[PDB]
Structure formats: structure tokens, C-alpha cells
From Swiss-Prot, chains D, F:
Source species: Paramecium bursaria Chlorella virus 1
Glycosylation sites per record: N279, N301, N398, N405
Further remark: The viral capsid possesses up to five major capsid protein variants. They behave as asymmetric capsid components.
Cleavable signal peptide: none
GO-annotated molecular function: lipid binding; structural molecule activity
Transmembrane segments annotated in the record for this chain: none
Compartments, as annotated in UniProt: Virion
Xref: SUPFAM superfamilies: Group II dsDNA viruses VP (SSF49749)
Family listed: Belongs to the NCLDV major capsid protein family.
InterPro entries the UniProt entry points to: Capsid_N (IPR031654), MCP_C (IPR007542), MCP_C_sf (IPR038519), VP_dsDNA_II (IPR016112)
Protein name per Swiss-Prot or TrEMBL: Major capsid protein
Keyword annotations: Capsid protein, Glycoprotein, Late protein, Lipid-binding, Virion
From Swiss-Prot, chain G:
Principal localisation: virion
Compartments, record wording: Virion
Assembly and binders: Interacts with the major capsid protein.
Signal is among the record's keywords: no
Induction: Expressed in the late phase of the viral replicative cycle.
GO cellular component, as recorded: viral capsid
Domain of life: Viruses
Name of the featured protein: Minor capsid protein 3
UniProt keyword list: Capsid protein, Late protein, Virion
Its job: One of the minor capsid proteins that constitute a network internal to the major capsid proteins and outside the lipid membrane. The minor capsid proteins glue and stabilize the capsomers.
Keyword check for Oxidoreductase: no
Amino acid sequence: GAAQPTMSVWVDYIFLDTQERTRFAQLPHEYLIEQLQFTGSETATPSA
Amino acid sequence: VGFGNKVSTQISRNGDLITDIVVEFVLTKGGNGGTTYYPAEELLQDVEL
Amino acid sequence: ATSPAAVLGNTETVTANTATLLTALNIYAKNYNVLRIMSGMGGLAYAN
Amino acid sequence: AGGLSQLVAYGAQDVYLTGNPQITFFKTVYRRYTNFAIESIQQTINGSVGFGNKVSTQISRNGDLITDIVVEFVLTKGGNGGTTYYPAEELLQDVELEIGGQRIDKHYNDWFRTYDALFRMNDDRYNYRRMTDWVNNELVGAQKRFYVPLIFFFNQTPGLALPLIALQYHEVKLYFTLASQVQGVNYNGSSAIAGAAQPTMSVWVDYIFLDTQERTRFAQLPHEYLIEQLQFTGSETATPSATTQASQNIRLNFNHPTKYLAWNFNNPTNYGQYTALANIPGACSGAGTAAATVTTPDYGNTGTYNEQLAVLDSAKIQLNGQDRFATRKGSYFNKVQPYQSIGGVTPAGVYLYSFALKPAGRQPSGTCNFSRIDNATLSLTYKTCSIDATSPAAVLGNTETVTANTATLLTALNIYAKNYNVLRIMSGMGGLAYAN
Amino acid sequence: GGLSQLVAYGAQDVYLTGNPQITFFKTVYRRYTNFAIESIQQTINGSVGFGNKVSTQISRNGDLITDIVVEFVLTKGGNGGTTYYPAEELLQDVELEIGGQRIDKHYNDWFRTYDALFRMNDDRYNYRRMTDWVNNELVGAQKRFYVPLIFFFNQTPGLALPLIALQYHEVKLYFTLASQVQGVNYNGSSAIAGAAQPTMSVWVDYIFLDTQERTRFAQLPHEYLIEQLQFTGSETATPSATTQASQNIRLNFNHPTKYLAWNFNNPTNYGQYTALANIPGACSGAGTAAATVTTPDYGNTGTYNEQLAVLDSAKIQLNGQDRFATRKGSYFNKVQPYQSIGGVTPAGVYLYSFALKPAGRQPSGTCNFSRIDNATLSLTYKTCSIDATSPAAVLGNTETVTANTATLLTALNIYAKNYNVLRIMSGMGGLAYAN
Amino acid sequence: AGGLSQLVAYGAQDVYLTGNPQITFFKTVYRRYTNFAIESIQQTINGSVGFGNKVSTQISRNGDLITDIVVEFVLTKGGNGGTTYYPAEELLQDVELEIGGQRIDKHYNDWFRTYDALFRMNDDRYNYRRMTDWVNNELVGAQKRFYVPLIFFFNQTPGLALPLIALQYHEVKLYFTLASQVQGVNYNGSSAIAGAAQPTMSVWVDYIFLDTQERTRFAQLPHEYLIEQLQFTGSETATPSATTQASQNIRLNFNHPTKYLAWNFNNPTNYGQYTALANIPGACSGAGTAAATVTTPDYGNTGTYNEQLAVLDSAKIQLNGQDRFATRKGSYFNKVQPYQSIGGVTPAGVYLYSFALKPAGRQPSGTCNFSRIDNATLSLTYKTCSIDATSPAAVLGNTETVTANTATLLTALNIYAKNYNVLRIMSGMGGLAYAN
Amino acid sequence: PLVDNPFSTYPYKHVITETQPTQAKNQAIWGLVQMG
């Protein structure tokens, strides 16, 4: 009898001004960013 | 949307920059106090940008 | 695992028999890249 | 009226098909070739021929170029109908291609079964069985002549024939390792068959004779051949028993431009067995009767198309730490990939992922050059082996993430890669340009 | 040895080896454009379920689109033999459009017809594995199914969709799912209680091109020669006795057509193109006291016994005149596909070609129905007088009669396969010739 | 990640694969072709149609070129299910094509059986059976329309279509002889069947019509076609009943550059029987039960694959006293030779040796020119017919050097040569450039 | 190589003359429909 979820994704947007939007869309950008890299594996917990 | 399914969100160009994204769920549990542990966190198994 | 006298009363080199269920190994690495946005396009400058 | 009713139906829409014709379908011109003759002769085998023995032969230089090689065996079976499964392919444990003292390629009996599982398609597969197995309900005591063709890069097309006339300083030799155990001939499972006959073998090569103008060019001019190699190491599996879906991250050791990766999950004790065994028709010895035993296959029908008996749940390949494609279930690699890339049916338990649009051919059609991939990993997830193999109701009646308890016998993972290299022939000596 | 014939060169063999142009044993292979192939998942817009219609927009991940495979996960509700290609009958149809402009559309009945007519050898057996249960699987069994699509760009990389150059008109696929799937949520007309809904996912195989080719695709115009499938359903009626009815069907086709194909089916039992009869594989329980000729032994619905077929003869007319003299239906079921395809066609599926080699994509002769004012398909039917329950007559009567159960093959499906041209300029494109 | 990750894995081993390229795989090219229409009309037959009758038909010059000739039969059988074996093919006994008074190509029902047995290699063979025989257990009294296509040099590819428009002064005729004895319709073995109706026959010919502009140019120009013909003479076998592996040295009478030789060992009473009959499933009438008789076949299963039932042990071709290749076993010529040459299944009892690399195709690829070879022979060595055909223990459980005692019933030998020559047509007349 | 058929090419002439955002280079535009 478990119900299905309701899902919505909400996004916080930034609006800029007249001169900033003109320059922002026209100029190239270089952002220094993070990434996560990951592959799951198997461990070796011993018995005794 | 449902359990075990896969959906995507395409970002509308609603603003000039996009910064903070939060995923909203409505859940009802079938168990008692102490039977859950971050149920909204495990709910989202693999999210890709 | 069923006797707290043994679980709360031992040395650093041992643990509970129930510990053998921790079979999934998850090793994460967080890293830098550069997000290079030129002419309306984005992407990763350095990646393999 | 008649055909002319279409011929006169000339409009605007069809002009781009019939205006200013370049091709007429009805007047063919055939290109003229240079005279040659094909001859097939035997070579002397150096070494004692038998079970577990390794022998070699040097290709007698009766030709200008070599196109095909067939290994012939005489076997007598110690069992009856259904007790054998490609006994000639199993006996041919491996074959090494050597040109000038260095290794070019080496194929293993399991590779031949995999190639047959993937790329030898149509009723032609039936000939393959006919040349390698007992397919007419033969009984114990029967003796038969078998033909195991080799599948080196130059064996299926004349275009890469080995131009021996141009290798006048190098020997080309074939090394044949014969199996110590062959199911139904000297062993039935692990039980020795008393009185089993020692096999007899001969090696035959198809030589091409060229005429005066063409063989002169071959002898004096250098050559660069685009050839194929097999890369292989046999890996171990972690097939789960119950309550869990185990996974592995198998590190791959490949280099050179690769056409495709293929793999199977073998039962090392039963040649060519790539799936679980069950108490259903063709799935185990005695299946359907009170004598059914799920630990021993009904060997002649070892191969199946029953997905429930295949062990793989899902797979993905990672290159240099990155996803190469999204995760697929095992049923993808033994259906969608051979369907799109080959156009035949692949028996359950054999899987293929191609990088090539047409891996069945020789014309390069896309490659994975592992010379620039520093860490290649094949990630596998297994189905849980919780179905009781003895219950037809549970084997023909359950879900996509489980298989039978007998799948845990599939302890060996055989990963194959086919690649391109260049065989340069210069001043009578041959060799590969790219070594790794 | 071989030199014994090599020296035996003469006069008449000059036409074979005089002044050679080629040598067979040193083949030079061509160097190609660097690319990579990747298959990724597309998301489905809409609720996936029986009788529902959903759409998929194909994302812009790569440069070219080639193979698209629809993956369905089904649980059967019956025993072995109660299913007959569930995956593709569920895939009721797929509509292809670019920027809202229809390019093509395929129907579940066509997928069965194409699989029955052009796909051949073990390839078709593999297909069966991809769409059906072939090991006598029982109730509750789950299998993942793959239904490859057969649009003009799906079978050869040479006609792949130039996403680079299709910037302003998105590529979309609309998927209509069947309300009834035999052996999964219905058994005949009866609902199967507890049957699960299908899970579906659309996989798209992308090609990634290197630097110079991408530029070339982005700046140069393109002309691709593509196929279309033309279809609408028709109605027919075959008499039970005393007569062989004729029927004249007005065709509504346009564009250079390389073949026409058609079948006669029972609209309730998917893929049934022949009458059912009390002979092995021809009906449920066939050969036993329980044999019933109104319900098929579904997993064997397809047969090769044309005496269960309804068609007697057929003739194609153009503008009031005969194209060829009337020929019996068995010509169109067994010989035309021998001449034009090379495989084997099951009974009830018929082909007539205008092309020499319609199986291939290189054009080989067409009938452009755009210059024809009246194209008519004339049919003559067999008299449905054989008692389907008596093998004595079903396996032993004359060529002009068929089973009484053949009167249920009332759905007449006539397909036309034609050429059009997909032309791309300045970031967008579409088909040059409409009608 | 994914494809872009793979795309950049570019290095030294790619310079010969993707560097300085000539082609792409992602843009195909179609060609604009001469406008034509296809037509099919029925030809009349001059003469009385019946069993043992000779009839002929002249092809009406309605079209410009002829591409495909299909002969229709309507037959009613007097036997039960499994008592027939290609009755339409046995009936179409002799077919020959005459151009202007000269014969250029002749085919026999036994050849058609060999072609179906050798070159049809998939669904095509099944479909061929479908239109030549009954395949759905039909009972006595059933009637069926049969379609027996002819295989003249122009009946498979449009490129050699016979250009009637350039043969303004010649008659083109098809001469037919229909078999007097057809199994299951007029005779059951040797016994006549009462109530055996005569066949209904007509011949359907597929015409090509060309557009006026290229039809005029096509008709006016002289033409040469490189075409293939069948050469054939009958022979006799030398099959002993015991203790001896008999040999016979057959002198061959063939001419012209030949692609291959093919031969079969036929029971002259039972059409298409190329093996011994035996009391094993499918190998004789009643096989497997007490009524089994090894002298009469289970006709519907006449074609089998168990070479144990073969009569031929080995064969060798010699040219002017020299071995053409070393002596090989019959299983070589039945199984692996067509694997190498054509790529498909051949039933037991049919043997070939190919001079061409790929004789299945029409592009010339190596021929043996018997117009310059004076003395070509074919040496056959038979198996010892020491197996008791009635005992499965001996039929299914013996060595390759022996065959069934019923192999002695195989008394006719048929050796075929398929070969090239040139068809020349000028100013309304044509014929072959070279005799024989 | 293609002829202009006045009864079949009109839908094509229509779409290839449809207004599209071809001047969206380095523009600050709120809505761009999945261009590429």
C-alpha cells in the first residue's frame, strides 16, 4: 500500500542588469569547477 | 516519476545564471519512528549533470 | 555482536561478526577541471 | 497496358532517379584478373600427435601466397548420441601463428567456439558442427574425419594472403596444442574412458600459384598488409549464490585498434558450456525424466538460447575512469549488439560489444585504439543464482535479476579483443610495425 | 599441382585474364573518418502503459543518429505458446517527424510483415528472441525485449540523421502502445488479472565525428535518399460457398514506389495471416480431442501452408489497364520474394515488386504513382468451404478452396514502400516531395 | 566521457586507419539508372503436355531483355505425406535454351537438385522446397501449384539479361522434356499409380522494357556477354558389395574455363537419392519400427546429412598425368570444400572441387581451362559396403572406411562442369564465340 | 538533380522559408528552443 512519490525540481535563478547581461552573453568564460569520479567495488571483510 | 524509475530535468533559461538546485519530494512512510534513515537521500540513487 | 560486554570491551584490531555484511566498497575522488564556455557552448577542457 | 504502363509514367518526382543515367543494371562488365591456381596439400607434423601433446609444422613452400589452413582429425567416440560437443574444436586447444621467429596471433579452442557463437552465421553454422561434431545421432564406436578450419586474418579472404615468395628469409610455422581431455572421446565429464583411441591429425594448407608477371611483383616489391590479431587473458568470476548481486571491475590489458570486445562465462570442466544447467529440455543430462541431473549437461545440446540460464545481469565499460556507454542488462549484449553488427543469433552466455560498424568484415569500420586508453575496465553485475535448477516451474517461471543455482559453476570469464596491426614485408623479412 | 592448370592458358580465356585490371590476393582497404559510437538513454514524455501514447524527443548528444532500439520489460500471463511477438504488437506504431513535419510512420502489423518478408535466416530467429519467448517459458516469467526500429536511417550508417545540420528542427518519435497484448494482459478477448504494465525505455545510438567532418556537416548542404512507408487500412470479405468473390481496391499511393506488399489478417489475433485449422500448429489443441479452430496456438500462429491462405489470385492495374495478367496468390507469397529478396515468406503475406532488388537500398526500378490517376489492386478469393476441423479436407482439398475459418481474415493491409529525398540546408531540412 | 572520450583516443596506430582518409561511412551514394519497367506475361507451349512428352516454347519478343523464367506446374499426388521429393523438379526433366538454331545451355533435373543442394544455402532452399514439393504434411488427393525457376546464365542477375531487342533475326526457344516417372504422382517406387492425372503447365517469363532513348542505343550497339554454361555427360559407378575399396579412373570430357566440378552418386530409380538407405530415422521407409525397409526411401526425407551413408571414400583430379592436388576423403568434398568456396550447407552425397575462389558469384575468380588440357581425369575410390543397413548398431556405430550394403543400389554417376565463355550478338543475330 | 514539382514541393518551400533564430550568436536571449 505504499504510495508513489511526488517529485518537483526547484531551481534558484540569478537575473542580471542591462550592461551585465550584454557583456555576460557576449564574453567567453572560464570557470574552475569540481567533478566527482567514482566506480563502486567490492571489499574483503574477513570472517575469523 | 515513481520508485525505481529515471527522469530528467531540462533547465529552462529562466534566468541569466543558475546556482542552487534542490529536489523536492512528498513521501509517506509505512513504518514507525526509527524505521527510516535519510529516506529522501537514498531515494535519489544517481543524479547526472 | 549479540553481547555488548564483548563488543564494548575489546581492542582496536577486532570487530563484530556482523561486520562481514559491509561488502560494498565505495572509494570517491573529488577533483578539479575547467569549464570552458566560448561561443554559446560549454564543456570540459581536461578529461579522460 | 503492361510494363510500358510504368515506363511511360515519367514525372517530376522520379527524375532524380532516371535523369542522366550513370549505371545500367542490365549490362555488366567483369573486371579481368591475373591467372592463378589453387592447390590444397598436407604438411608433415613434427612431434607425437595425441592428447595433451603439442606439435608444430612448417608450411611447405609450395606456393607464392597462402590463403587457407584446415586441421584434420580422425576421432572415435567412447560415448553415444548427445555425449559430444565440438570434440574436434575442444581437441584443437590452441593454434599459434608464427612468422620469422616472432608471434603474430594465437587462437584458443574457446575462441573458436566464441567466433562460431558470434560471426559464423546462417545454416553455415551447421556445416561447422558437421565438420567438428557428431550430428546424426551416431553411436559409440563410430570413427569420423573432422575439419577444423583456422580463422586467422588471412584465412577468410584472399586479400591478406601471406606472400611467402616475399618472405624468402623467414619461416612461417603453425604450433598446435592438443587438449588433454576431450568430452566423449577420452573423458566423460572427469571420468576417463577406458580404451579411448589416440587421435590422428594432419594439417592441410591451400596454396596459390601466381603467373610470371604477378609473382615477380610480389617477390621484388615491399608490402604492407592490414592484418588482425586476437588479444586474450582468461579471467575469474565472482558468481553469487544468494541474497546478493555481486559485481566485478575487471581490469583489461589491451592495446592496438580494436574492432570489438567479446566475452563468455565458461564452466572450465565442460567445454563450450556458457550457461546454467536445468531440468528442462536440452538444459541438462536426462532433463525431463527421473534421471535428470543438473550437474552434467546433455552435451550435444550444451548451447542454448534460453536467457534465464545466462548468468550476466548487466555490464558497462569504462575508459580512463569514464563511462563509455550506459549500463545494459546482459540480454543487451547477446541480442542487440550481434543483431546490429552481425545479423545472426548468438547463443546465450556469449556477449559482444562492438566499436566497429561491420566487425564481421575486414574493411575497418571504426576502432577503439587502446594505445591511448590507459585504464580500461569491464564492469559486470551478476544475477542472483537462487532458482532451483531441478524445478522446471522455477526455471521457466521467474524474473530478470535471478538465475539457477548451477550458474555458480561458470567460474571462468573469457574476454577477447580483435585488433588491427600492420604486417610489413621488406626485403624478404616480415614483421608487425606496432608491438605491445 | 596447381601449375598444371596455370600454364594451360589459351584463347577463349583472354576475356577472363587478358590485360588484368585487378588481383584478388593483395587487397587495399580504404582509410575512413574518425568517429565513435555510443548508445544512451532517452527519456519518455508521458505515462507508459497499455493503450497509452507517449513521445520521445531525441537529445542532441551526438552528430548523427543511427540505430534506435526500444526496450520493453514484460511479464507473461500464460504458458508456452500463448504469446506471438508481444514486444512488437505492443509497439502499435512509431511516427517519425522533424520539426513537426512527418517523415515516416511504421505500424505493428508492418513490423510483423517486414520481419515475415525481408528479415531472413537466423537473423529473424534472433529477432524472435528479441521480441518473444522462444523457450516455452511459463506464467510469471519476465524478459527484457528489444524492438529495433526500421526507419530509413536505422539499418545503414550511410543514411544517419545529420543532427549537426538539423539545428532548428528537432527529431521526435511518437509511440502508440497497444491496449491489448496477447499472453501479457489478454488471452484472446479475456483480460489477465494482475497483468503488469510494460516498462519502456528508448535507446539511441549516436555517432560522434571528429573535427573536419563535423565542420563539413555543419557547413555543407545534404541530399539523402530515404524511404517512406505509405499505409491506410482496408476492409475485405471472403464468401463461404458457391462463389469466389472478386474485389477491386482503389489504391491511394504517390512517389517512386519500389514494391507493394499486403496481407489478410484476423484483427483480433495479432499476426494471424492464415485460417486456423485442426492440423499441427494451426490452432489451439490441434491434433487432440480439445482442438478448437477459433483460437490459435499463438506461438505457432505463422505457418507456411498456403491452403490456409485466403487469396486465390491478384492483379495490379494502372489507369484502367492491366500491368500483368492475373496470377495466383502463391506466386506473390513464394516466388516474388525468391526473386526479389532471397528468403522465405509465410503464408498470407504477399509481395509484388517494381524494383529488381527492393531488399537493398540502392534504387533498382520504381513505379511512380504520382503520374497514375487510377491504381487498383484486384483480388480474387478462395471459397471458404473446407471444414477446418477435418484434416481430411484441410490437408487434402483443391487449390481454389480454403478453410471456413478464413472468413475471419477481414482486415486488408496494403503497404507501399517508396523513395523521397531528405534535403538539409542552413541548419534545417525536410522531405522535398509531398502528397 | 562516452563517445567523445573514445573519439579522442587518437594515436600512432590510427595513421593507417583514419589519417588522410578517402571515405566516410556516414554518407551513402545512390546512382541514377536507365529507366525501365518490369513485366511478366505467360508463354504458350507448342506440343502436348504430359509425363514423358517433349514440348517447346518460343519466347514472344514483347520486351527488350529477358531476366527470369519460371515454369509452373499444377500437380495432384496419389501418395501420402512424405511419399514425394521435389515432384515438380523431378518432372522438369530436361531443359535447354536454343538461340537461332544453336543450343547454348542445357540443364537436367539432377543438376537442379545439385544446384539446390549446393548453392541455395538458407531460407532460399526451404522456400525452394516450398514451391517444388509439399512441406506441410499434406495427404493423398492434395493438389498444389508449383514454381520451378530456371537457372540459365541470365536467370539470377539482371546484368546478363538476354537482349531480345538485339536478336531481330533469331528465335529463342525453350525445349522441355517432362519425366515419365515422377515419384508420388505416377509411380510409387516402381509401381504405377492409378488415377494419375496429367500436369497443367505454362511458362512465365519476366520481361524488361527500356526507355526509348537508351533502348535505341542499346539495340544498335554490338554486345558481348561473359556468361556461364553447364557441360554434362552421364557416367556409371563402381560400387562393390564387399572386401574391396574399388577405384575407377574416369576420363573427363569438358572444355572451356571452368569454375568448378561437381558430382553425385544417384539411385536412378529414386530421384535425388545420393546416399545409402538405412534403418535409422529419415534414412528409409518405416525407419525406426518393425516395418522399416532399407530398399525403399522415406522419400520426403531423401536428402540427409549423414556421410556414413556415403558411397565415395576419396577422390582426386589429375591433369595430363599429374595430380591436381593430393587425394582427399569424400567428407572433404562434401563439407569443408563448400565451406571454403560458397559458404553454406550441402547435404550428404553431393561433392565438388572448386577452381574458382568463390564460384557462387558471377565475377570470374580463377578457372581451369579444359580447352587446353587434353587429358583430365577424376579418380574415385569407394567405401567398402560392409555395414548391414538394417542394424543401427552398425549404421550409426562404425568407421569411415565402410558404408552400407545398400550403397550398391547407387549405380549412376553424374559429373558437372560449370564454365565461362562469351555470348556475342551483332546486327540482330547471336550465339557463343567458342564451341563445346 | 531534383525537379521542382509545383504540386509536391510547396510544403518544402514553406518550411525552408520559415523564420528561425539564426541571429542568436552572443545574444542575451531568454528563450532559445534547444538549438544546438
